[PDB]
Amino acid sequence: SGFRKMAFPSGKVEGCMVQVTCGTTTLNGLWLDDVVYCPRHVICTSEDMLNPNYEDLLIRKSNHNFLVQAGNVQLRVIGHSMQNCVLKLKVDTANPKTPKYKFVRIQPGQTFSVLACYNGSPSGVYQCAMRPNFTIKGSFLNGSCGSVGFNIDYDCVSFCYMHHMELPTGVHAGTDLEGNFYGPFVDRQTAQAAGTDTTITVNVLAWLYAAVINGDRWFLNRFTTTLNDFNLVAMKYNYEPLTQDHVDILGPLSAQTGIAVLDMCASLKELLQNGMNGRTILGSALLEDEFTPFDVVRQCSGVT
Amino acid sequence: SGFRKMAFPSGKVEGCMVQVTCGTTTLNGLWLDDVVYCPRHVICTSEDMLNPNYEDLLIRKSNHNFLVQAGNVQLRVIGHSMQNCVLKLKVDTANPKTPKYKFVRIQPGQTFSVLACYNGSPSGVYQCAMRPNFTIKGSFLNGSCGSVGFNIDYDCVSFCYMHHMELPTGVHAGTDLEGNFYGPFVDRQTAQAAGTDTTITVNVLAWLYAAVINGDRWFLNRFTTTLNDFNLVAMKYNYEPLTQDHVDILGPLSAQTGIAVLDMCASLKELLQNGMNGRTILGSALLEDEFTPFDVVRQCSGVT
Ligand SMILES: *CC(=O)N1CCN(Cc2ccc(Cl)s2)CC1
Ligand SMILES: *CC(=O)N1CCN(Cc2ccc(Cl)s2)CC1
């Protein structure tokens, strides 16, 4: 019993982290096979980030300008290219610690673990979600860019995120491992505001299922609702509209607990309208939305 | 910017996790040098856990009864001994992945990372604190026992916890790596109730410092207090008494932010007396107490 915000074990990703510098101090790269992936803003100066022309800046860079260090060992850069907002640095040595991996572009509401690194060295690991506004709520200081987000399915690491960007509101933006930003964000120091941070309704319901499984049940009530009725309340409270797809995804948690998805919707509706009244659910005083239904099943069943 | 509940990178500990069985299904062990450490209740049957006599039960066990598996490779057990509530299984092979390590017994209020494992396989990593009642609030299902808690100082893993025990209230109990339980708990299926889960005041103040550093400042007020006045309010709300030692430990965060510890105490006092009024601090609706002052400095400074 007990339910915790849990990250994937980071070992497989720790084995992939390197340091990159290209004239203007350091950030992180991801070393898979004989390619090191890093944010293209590694090539920027303190004059460049306002209105950078990356193709023009890159022309001034040669393989020998990209200093790539794995622990205390230097890697030889034998090629470099820009793909969208990432650089791919070809090295002469395959990373011997390369795990089975995939690059996946996640949807908003999907969770992943971040391995926060500085200068190619891991500092810690935490769980995130891709927000509906395509930001993430991370912990990233100068030097953390190139830190990656991932899921693991048994032995295969799915990399979904690379850190690039802090908005003036202290939320985070980055790319998939093809270098495409999540949402409308750009690697330029400009006026970029996040949209509404809507709550991931399907994740809140998953977490209410987790609470019931782990003994927190005070918020179950005598009510039910419909998708359309629930969605009127979701709208008012900046919750994502609940779809039949979301209901279908919650089916296993419904089956295990014997609480119909629409009955749990009616619980969530009362919590939205009435608040917690100073009570907690799985040690939280607000409705947690960074556990997916898959996350709840995984943690509740002891998957490795 | 941003402040997250962050665990240590788990790679160094993943390298140490094995599976142990001794007649009655499986739990985890920790493989350091040529010794595998595991809970002594691995030797129990379904008749034993009510009133186990571990010395008597152990007499029936030989080296060949302890099945120790690192991935798909079996380890040869050449000796076994009981130290308090752990077994030490001597194997003929030093773990080649043994990191620099220490065994430390932590004080209540100290935080650590847990690598949750099942059958010697890591499932995930989360941050805990040793509670003032010497429980921890974990995520542990059957098979998770032998999972360990740790801190890392650069390259040295300090192991502080091994999981043994779930109380009927769904909180967790275990031992240091010398096999001594934290608090009054025993590895017996009996009436064991946790005492008052008091809030770790010094950690709450640390986290309020973290909030200020990361832009969350609405709870700063025009007031100050004294240790004795604050402690009257701590008492009423089941907070640990604040000591001059705690004030001294918060000195660096005080210095960096320019907010006197006793002024932050006055903020915490108003939050206790008035509540959040529906507001949040670093994405929490309650006062977070599982970040130490060391944790806040580490995360706010990007230590690796
Ligand atoms: C996330 C991170 O490390 N940073 C630091 C770099 N910064 C942009 C710049 C790149 C070259 C420079 Cl000189 S400044 C983004 C945030
Ligand atoms: C934490 C954990 O894995 N468990 C399962 C084992 N249980 C005690 C027992 C040991 C031998 C048995 Cl048979 S049952 C404690 C919780």
Side-chain angles (χ1 to χ4, degrees):
Chain A
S1 215
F3 196 85
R4 272 278 184 184
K5 190 66 69 59
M6 196 176 288
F8 290 97
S10 52
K12 284 173 193 301
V13 177
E14 290 173 52
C16 300
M17 297 313 306
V18 301
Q19 186 186 76
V20 192
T21 313
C22 194
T24 64
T25 197
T26 296
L27 45 61
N28 305 282
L30 184 71
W31 182 22
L32 302 169
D33 300 321
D34 61 348
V35 180
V36 172
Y37 297 83
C38 76
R40 64 174 180 173
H41 71 224
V42 71
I43 70 177
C44 288
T45 67
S46 179
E47 281 106 310
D48 291 335
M49 265 299 279
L50 299 174
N51 187 24
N53 188 305
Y54 284 103
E55 276 292 16
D56 290 340
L57 294 169
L58 196 50
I59 290 172
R60 306 296 150 201
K61 301 305 177 178
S62 296
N63 295 333
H64 72 265
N65 294 130
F66 298 96
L67 301 179
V68 183
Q69 199 177 318
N72 249 70
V73 85
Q74 207 70 18
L75 304 184
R76 193 182 294 280
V77 180
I78 59 164
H80 68 277
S81 52
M82 184 162 59
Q83 184 177 13
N84 300 314
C85 298
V86 298
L87 300 180
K88 297 195 315 222
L89 309 174
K90 200 192 176 181
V91 286
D92 74 349
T93 307
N95 183 357
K97 294 178 202 175
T98 307
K100 299 174 209 213
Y101 72 90
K102 288 178 181 171
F103 297 166
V104 303
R105 185 177 183 81
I106 60 170
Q107 288 305 313
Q110 289 309 109
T111 58
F112 59 88
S113 310
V114 172
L115 183 64
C117 303
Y118 298 91
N119 307 138
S121 294
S123 51
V125 70
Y126 52 84
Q127 201 59 0
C128 278
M130 181 54 57
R131 304 305 309 169
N133 62 7
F134 294 101
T135 70
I136 76 169
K137 286 194 179 129
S139 175
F140 295 116
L141 293 164
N142 288 328
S144 66
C145 281
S147 299
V148 298
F150 62 93
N151 286 277
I152 313 175
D153 186 346
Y154 178 47
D155 56 340
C156 185
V157 182
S158 290
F159 293 103
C160 53
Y161 181 86
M162 178 169 272
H163 187 51
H164 288 247
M165 190 86 257
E166 194 161 59
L167 304 190
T169 57
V171 304
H172 297 117
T175 70
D176 66 18
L177 268 294
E178 291 167 19
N180 290 129
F181 268 87
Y182 289 101
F185 302 115
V186 301
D187 47 2
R188 189 190 168 213
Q189 188 181 314
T190 190
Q192 305 194 73
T196 309
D197 204 354
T198 70
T199 305
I200 312 148
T201 312
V202 65
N203 290 3
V204 177
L205 289 165
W207 168 85
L208 287 175
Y209 278 109
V212 170
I213 293 168
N214 291 283
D216 284 354
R217 318 200 147 132
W218 62 260
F219 54 83
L220 297 180
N221 55 38
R222 285 165 181 286
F223 314 147
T224 201
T225 188
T226 66
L227 274 189
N228 295 151
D229 175 71
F230 178 80
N231 282 338
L232 294 185
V233 177
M235 170 91 70
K236 165 163 158 106
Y237 288 95
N238 293 146
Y239 271 58
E240 289 299 289
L242 201 63
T243 72
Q244 188 57 48
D245 276 1
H246 297 140
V247 177
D248 291 350
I249 283 161
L250 290 166
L253 287 175
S254 183
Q256 193 201 312
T257 62
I259 297 178
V261 173
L262 284 184
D263 296 1
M264 192 66 92
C265 285
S267 280
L268 175 49
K269 173 174 159 189
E270 295 304 304
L271 283 168
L272 285 177
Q273 286 180 338
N274 297 338
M276 310 283 283
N277 285 112
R279 304 188 274 267
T280 65
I281 301 170
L282 293 175
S284 178
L286 55 68
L287 304 170
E288 295 294 331
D289 82 336
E290 296 195 354
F291 296 100
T292 69
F294 295 140
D295 290 340
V296 170
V297 168
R298 190 187 299 102
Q299 186 172 157
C300 287
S301 84
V303 177
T304 64
Chain B
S1 215
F3 196 85
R4 272 278 184 184
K5 190 66 69 59
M6 196 176 288
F8 290 97
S10 52
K12 284 173 193 301
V13 177
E14 290 173 52
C16 300
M17 297 313 306
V18 301
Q19 186 186 76
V20 192
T21 313
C22 194
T24 64
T25 197
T26 296
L27 45 61
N28 305 282
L30 184 71
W31 182 22
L32 302 169
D33 300 321
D34 61 348
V35 180
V36 172
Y37 297 83
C38 76
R40 64 174 180 173
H41 71 224
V42 71
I43 70 177
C44 288
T45 67
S46 179
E47 281 106 310
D48 291 335
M49 265 299 279
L50 299 174
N51 187 24
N53 188 305
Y54 284 103
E55 276 292 16
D56 290 340
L57 294 169
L58 196 50
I59 290 172
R60 306 296 150 201
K61 301 305 177 178
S62 296
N63 295 333
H64 72 265
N65 294 130
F66 298 96
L67 301 179
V68 183
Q69 199 177 318
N72 249 70
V73 85
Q74 207 70 18
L75 304 184
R76 193 182 294 280
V77 180
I78 59 164
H80 68 277
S81 52
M82 184 162 59
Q83 184 177 13
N84 300 314
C85 298
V86 298
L87 300 180
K88 297 195 315 222
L89 309 174
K90 200 192 176 181
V91 286
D92 74 349
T93 307
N95 183 357
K97 294 178 202 175
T98 307
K100 299 174 209 213
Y101 72 90
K102 288 178 181 171
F103 297 166
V104 303
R105 185 177 183 81
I106 60 170
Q107 288 305 313
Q110 289 309 109
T111 58
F112 59 88
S113 310
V114 172
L115 183 64
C117 303
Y118 298 91
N119 307 138
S121 294
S123 51
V125 70
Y126 52 84
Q127 201 59 0
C128 278
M130 181 54 57
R131 304 305 309 169
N133 62 7
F134 294 101
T135 70
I136 76 169
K137 286 194 179 129
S139 175
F140 295 116
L141 293 164
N142 288 328
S144 66
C145 281
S147 299
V148 298
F150 62 93
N151 286 277
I152 313 175
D153 186 346
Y154 178 47
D155 56 340
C156 185
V157 182
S158 290
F159 293 103
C160 53
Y161 181 86
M162 178 169 272
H163 187 51
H164 288 247
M165 190 86 257
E166 194 161 59
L167 304 190
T169 57
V171 304
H172 297 117
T175 70
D176 66 18
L177 268 294
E178 291 167 19
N180 290 129
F181 268 87
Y182 289 101
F185 302 115
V186 301
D187 47 2
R188 189 190 168 213
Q189 188 181 314
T190 190
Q192 305 194 73
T196 309
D197 204 354
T198 70
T199 305
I200 312 148
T201 312
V202 65
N203 290 3
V204 177
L205 289 165
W207 168 85
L208 287 175
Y209 278 109
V212 170
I213 293 168
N214 291 283
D216 284 354
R217 318 200 147 132
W218 62 260
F219 54 83
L220 297 180
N221 55 38
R222 285 165 181 286
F223 314 147
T224 201
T225 188
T226 66
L227 274 189
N228 295 151
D229 175 71
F230 178 80
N231 282 338
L232 294 185
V233 177
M235 170 91 70
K236 165 163 158 106
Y237 288 95
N238 293 146
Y239 271 58
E240 289 299 289
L242 201 63
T243 72
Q244 188 57 48
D245 276 1
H246 297 140
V247 177
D248 291 350
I249 283 161
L250 290 166
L253 287 175
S254 183
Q256 193 201 312
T257 62
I259 297 178
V261 173
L262 284 184
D263 296 1
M264 192 66 92
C265 285
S267 280
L268 175 49
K269 173 174 159 189
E270 295 304 304
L271 283 168
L272 285 177
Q273 286 180 338
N274 297 338
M276 310 283 283
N277 285 112
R279 304 188 274 267
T280 65
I281 301 170
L282 293 175
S284 178
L286 55 68
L287 304 170
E288 295 294 331
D289 82 336
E290 296 195 354
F291 296 100
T292 69
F294 295 140
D295 290 340
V296 170
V297 168
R298 190 187 299 102
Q299 186 172 157
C300 287
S301 84
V303 177
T304 64

